[PDB]
Amino acid sequence: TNLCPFGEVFNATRFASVYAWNRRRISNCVADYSVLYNTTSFSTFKCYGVSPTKLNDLCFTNVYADSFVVRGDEVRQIAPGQTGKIADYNYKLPDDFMGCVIAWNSISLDAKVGGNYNYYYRLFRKSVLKPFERDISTQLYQAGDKPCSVEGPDCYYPLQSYGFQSTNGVGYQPYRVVVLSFELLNAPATVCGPKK
Amino acid sequence: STIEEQAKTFLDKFNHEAEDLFYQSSLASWNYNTNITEENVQNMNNAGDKWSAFLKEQSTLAQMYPLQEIQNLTVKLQLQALQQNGSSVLSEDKSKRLNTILNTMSTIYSTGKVCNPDNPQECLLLEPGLNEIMANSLDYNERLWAWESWRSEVGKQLRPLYEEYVVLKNEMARANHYEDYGDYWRGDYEVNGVDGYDYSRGQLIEDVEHTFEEIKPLYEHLHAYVRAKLMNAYPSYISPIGCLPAHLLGDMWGRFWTNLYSLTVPFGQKPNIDVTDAMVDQAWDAQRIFKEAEKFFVSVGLPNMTQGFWENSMLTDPGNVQKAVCHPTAWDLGKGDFRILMCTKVTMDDFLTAHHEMGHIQYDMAYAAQPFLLRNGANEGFHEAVGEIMSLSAATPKHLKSIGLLSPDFQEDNETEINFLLKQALTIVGTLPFTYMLEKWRWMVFKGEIPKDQWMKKWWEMKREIVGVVEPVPHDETYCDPASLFHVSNDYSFIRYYTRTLYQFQFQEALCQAAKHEGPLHKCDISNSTEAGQKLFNMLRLGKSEPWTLALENVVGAKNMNVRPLLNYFEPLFTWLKDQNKNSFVGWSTDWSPYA
Numbered sequence: 001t002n003l004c005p006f007g008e009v010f011n012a013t014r015f016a017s018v019y020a021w022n023r024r025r026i027s028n029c030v031a032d033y034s035v036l037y038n039t040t041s042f043s044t045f046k047c048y049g050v051s052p053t054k055l056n057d058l059c060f061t062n063v064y065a066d067s068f069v070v071r072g073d074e075v076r077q078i079a080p081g082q083t084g085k086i087a088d089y090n091y092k093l094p095d096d097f098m099g100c101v102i103a104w105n106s107i108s109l110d111a112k113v114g115g116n117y118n119y120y121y122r123l124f125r126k127s128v129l130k131p132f133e134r135d136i137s138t139q140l141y142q143a144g145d146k147p148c149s150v151e152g153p154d155c156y157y158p159l160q161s162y163g164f165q166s167t168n169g170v171g172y173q174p175y176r177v178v179v180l181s182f183e184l185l186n187a188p189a190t191v192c193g194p195k196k
Numbered sequence: 197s198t199i200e201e202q203a204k205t206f207l208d209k210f211n212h213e214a215e216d217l218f219y220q221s222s223l224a225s226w227n228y229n230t231n232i233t234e235e236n237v238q239n240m241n242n243a244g245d246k247w248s249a250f251l252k253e254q255s256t257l258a259q260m261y262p263l264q265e266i267q268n269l270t271v272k273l274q275l276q277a278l279q280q281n282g283s284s285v286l287s288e289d290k291s292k293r294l295n296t297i298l299n300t301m302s303t304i305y306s307t308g309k310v311c312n313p314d315n316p317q318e319c320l321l322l323e324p325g326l327n328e329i330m331a332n333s334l335d336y337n338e339r340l341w342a343w344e345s346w347r348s349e350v351g352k353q354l355r356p357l358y359e360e361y362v363v364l365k366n367e368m369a370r371a372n373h374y375e376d377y378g379d380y381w382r383g384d385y386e387v388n389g390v391d392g393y394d395y396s397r398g399q400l401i402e403d404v405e406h407t408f409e410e411i412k413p414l415y416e417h418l419h420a421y422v423r424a425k426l427m428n429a430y431p432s433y434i435s436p437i438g439c440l441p442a443h444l445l446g447d448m449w450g451r452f453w454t455n456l457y458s459l460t461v462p463f464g465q466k467p468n469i470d471v472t473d474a475m476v477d478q479a480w481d482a483q484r485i486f487k488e489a490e491k492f493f494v495s496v497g498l499p500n501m502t503q504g505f506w507e508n509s510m511l512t513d514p515g516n517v518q519k520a521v522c523h524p525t526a527w528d529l530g531k532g533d534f535r536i537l538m539c540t541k542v543t544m545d546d547f548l549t550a551h552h553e554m555g556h557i558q559y560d561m562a563y564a565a566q567p568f569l570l571r572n573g574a575n576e577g578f579h580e581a582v583g584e585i586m587s588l589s590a591a592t593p594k595h596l597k598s599i600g601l602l603s604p605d606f607q608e609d610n611e612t613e614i615n616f617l618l619k620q621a622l623t624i625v626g627t628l629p630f631t632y633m634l635e636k637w638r639w640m641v642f643k644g645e646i647p648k649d650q651w652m653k654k655w656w657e658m659k660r661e662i663v664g665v666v667e668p669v670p671h672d673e674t675y676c677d678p679a680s681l682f683h684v685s686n687d688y689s690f691i692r693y694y695t696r697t698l699y700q701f702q703f704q705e706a707l708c709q710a711a712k713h714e715g716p717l718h719k720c721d722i723s724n725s726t727e728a729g730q731k732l733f734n735m736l737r738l739g740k741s742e743p744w745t746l747a748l749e750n751v752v753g754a755k756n757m758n759v760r761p762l763l764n765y766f767e768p769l770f771t772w773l774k775d776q777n778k779n780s781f782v783g784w785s786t787d788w789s790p791y792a
């Protein structure tokens with residue numbers, strides 16, 4: 001029962017944007033959640049539905065870990081039953097969420113000088129995102145009643161670019177977000193705790 | 197779908213896509229004002245042009261959406277501002293020369309040196325020098341030379357630039373549904389959406405006069421008291437019936453009479469309310485001034501300054517190595533980035549302005565939640581008033597004693613309050629006629645009621661009558677003395693400072709109700725009162741979204757500017773000034789001049 005590779009997804013060199021978050025399956029390994037508690041750089045470590053202290057004592061058949069980078073004050077949208085631009089168009093958590101939401105500051109990495117416009121997010125979408133949905137569409141957004149073949153007065157490119165700069169305030173500073181969900185099925189405990 | 201929703205999803209595309217542009221203009225604009233280079237003037241202008249291009253392209257796209265269909269009023273304001281044709285109504289012939297003139301008049305003001313008539317290689321510049329001379333010197337000739345040389349060597353060269361500045365600006369406002377450029381500024385205070393809370397462009401000009409009339413009796417007894425105490429400092433130089441020489445006033449223009457406190461303090465032997473001397477002896481560095489200002493807002497519940505403030509603000513002079521625009525400025529760059537640029541010296545006049553400029557930041561930080569186009573003060577006066585509410589509270593001896601700048605055994609008295617009130621009146625009461633006259637001169641110039649050959653005649657015809665200040669030396673029409681101030685060379689609406697003052701005591705009275713206060717309107721340090729801070733926080737968070745008449749009413753209870761709180765604040769001085777002018781003349785003769 002080799003240790004679960006939680007370092008790969010957290011300490012990753014590059015984190016994806018929000019409109020295309022990165023999901024990594026975690027299974028066939030005993031998960032050490034106690035190493036996650038120790039890390040003090042996590043500005044917003046808040047598990048929802050399960051206490052972190054009893055995570056090591058419980059086992060799950062699957063562990064999904066989602067990684068992406070949002071704005072500083074948009075971290076609150078990565079939470080159960082929240083509403084906004086990110087939660088409704090980029091990454092929606094289930095209202096019955098049983099898992100964790102972890103985020104820390106990524107100025108040293110995601111932000112530079114000039115403008116780090118590398119990161120993007122979805123500004124417009126016809127429907128609200130159903131929970132655990134990802135929309136990669138680059139197709140335009142027809143706000144008006146005129147057909148859209150080019151970005152014009154009422155045709156908008158759905159994705160826009162975060163402007164991450166080291167001079168930005170905490171609200172407009174890049175934050176990397178890792179969301180650990182859980183999934184119990186009729187299957188053996190592929191993710192367990194050190195005791196078992 | 198509806199056209200209002202079609203316009204909501206247009207502003208949403210605008211707001212998110214606009215900030216990084218405005219900020220980019222800002223960062224470059226900050227990098228010039230804090231670092232004067234020919235490399236950075238280009239960088240600042242390029243981002244300004246790209247920001248302007250984004251305005252033009254997203255203003256034309258805003259015209260397609262009609263306002264009359266939109267019902268959500270907060271949406272209507274944002275569309276209304278974005279649909280406004282600004283300098284776009286000016287052709288490439290006009291907009292270039294207008295911008296070229298505006299930059300040239302700013303640079304002449306920025307690079308304004310005066311050479312000593314003996315040793316011409318010695319040049320004094322208005323910011324470092326030529327302001328200490330016009331605020332500390334008691335030599336009538338030295339003041340006369342600093343005041344006349346600045347308004348002739350620098351002022352005259354702005355006369356041709358100001359003349360074409362007026363006509364090219366007037367062509368902009370008249371094209372964009374106004375009467376003159378003065379109305380463009382006066383439109384700041386207009387509300388035409390909510391019955392009862394509505395306002396008009398002219399209602400300001402009538403309210404200002406109607407409220408300035410009730411200031412005139414207070415100003416006269418301040419003028420008379422200062423005149424009699426300036427007659428001792430400058431014997432055989434001031435007429436006891438006549439007006440006041442301009443250069444003998446507190447600053448370069450007579451805008452503030454604060455420095456005259458040394459010559460006009462009623463009771464010198466009482467401990468000095470001007471704690472400038474106290475700070476220097478206590479090694480109050482510039483950081484402490486803003487740190488102590490920061491603790492004041494923290495005490496009322498308002499947030500700490502952001503970490504980007506202390507890291508990225510400029511609070512001192514960077515030195516001779518790199519130049520800087522050291523006119524005090526508060527910057528809402530956006531992106532959560534709040535900075536203050538100021539050449540803070542260890543003086544009370546900089547300690548109070550640190551509270552004033554941080555008041556802008558606290559206003560800027562609060563309405564950051566508002567959409568970008570609504571990220572602004574309720575009017576022009578509201579932004580300036582908010583910072584003054586703090587310096588109004590921070591200047592009280594009780595607050596000064598609380599911060600270690602006054603004796604721990606300092607006991608209040610009848611005499612000390614007069615010393616404190618008079619110093620406040622020199623800054624506040626003394627500037628109201630100066631502001632009212634200056635704008636009324638500009639307003640009538642923009643309306644054209646003052647012809648080009650009667651410009652300087654009418655500038656001092658009113659300065660003698662309205663402000664009681666006289667020209668030490670006769671001035672041709674070749675002079676352009678109005679432009680010698682910053683807010684006229686750099687084209688800023690100046691009536692914001694008259695309206696600011698009537699607001700600031702209106703606010704303070706209500707904030708001194710939310711803080712359970714015993715005594716008069718002074719001695720009213722709202723420090724440590726969270727109720728006073730949060731009552732203001734509600735007003736600050738609104739910004740431009742709710743009408744300023746409503747925003748003021750929710751705070752103080754009046755839909756308009758009220759001069760009564762200002763007079764009640766100064767009533768212990770107004771009664772004391774009259775009793776100090778029994779054997780003195782109150783008023784001023786317009787006809788006397790120090791050269792006749």
Ligand SMILES: *[C@@H]1O[C@H](CO)[C@@H](O)[C@H](O)[C@H]1NC(C)=O
Nearest residue numbers: 006007008010011035036039
């Ligand atoms: C990231 O790496 C450091 C050392 O390189 C390690 O101590 C830390 O636990 C890692 N973080 C995670 C979440 O594994």
Ligand SMILES: *[C@@H]1O[C@H](CO)[C@@H](O)[C@H](O)[C@H]1NC(C)=O
Nearest residue numbers: 231232233234235236237518
């Ligand atoms: C001022 O600007 C110049 C170029 O415009 C730059 O080389 C210099 O480093 C700047 N000064 C400081 C102190 O950053």
Ligand SMILES: *[C@@H]1O[C@H](CO)[C@@H](O)[C@H](O)[C@H]1NC(C)=O
Nearest residue numbers: 204267268269270271272567
């Ligand atoms: C106008 O639309 C905004 C959209 O965010 C909404 O918050 C606001 O309540 C609306 N105004 C009214 C009066 O419904």
Ligand SMILES: *[C@@H]1O[C@H](CO)[C@@H](O)[C@H](O)[C@H]1NC(C)=O
Nearest residue numbers: 259279280281285371372373
């Ligand atoms: C702006 O100018 C256009 C023509 O370029 C005009 O149709 C429109 O009415 C103007 N908008 C305003 C608010 O004056």
Ligand SMILES: *[C@@H]1O[C@H](CO)[C@@H](O)[C@H](O)[C@H]1NC(C)=O
Nearest residue numbers: 490491494497498499500501
């Ligand atoms: C304000 O800043 C000081 C300085 O570090 C800090 O100790 C204090 O906790 C802060 N308080 C608030 C309310 O931000």
Ligand SMILES: *[C@@H]1O[C@H](CO)[C@@H](O)[C@H](O)[C@H]1NC(C)=O
Nearest residue numbers: 495594595598599721723724
């Ligand atoms: C505010 O409270 C602090 C905390 O004790 C105190 O030191 C300070 O003197 C108070 N401020 C005033 C103006 O009394």
Ligand SMILES: [Zn+2]
Nearest residue numbers: 552553580583
């Ligand atoms: Zn100000």
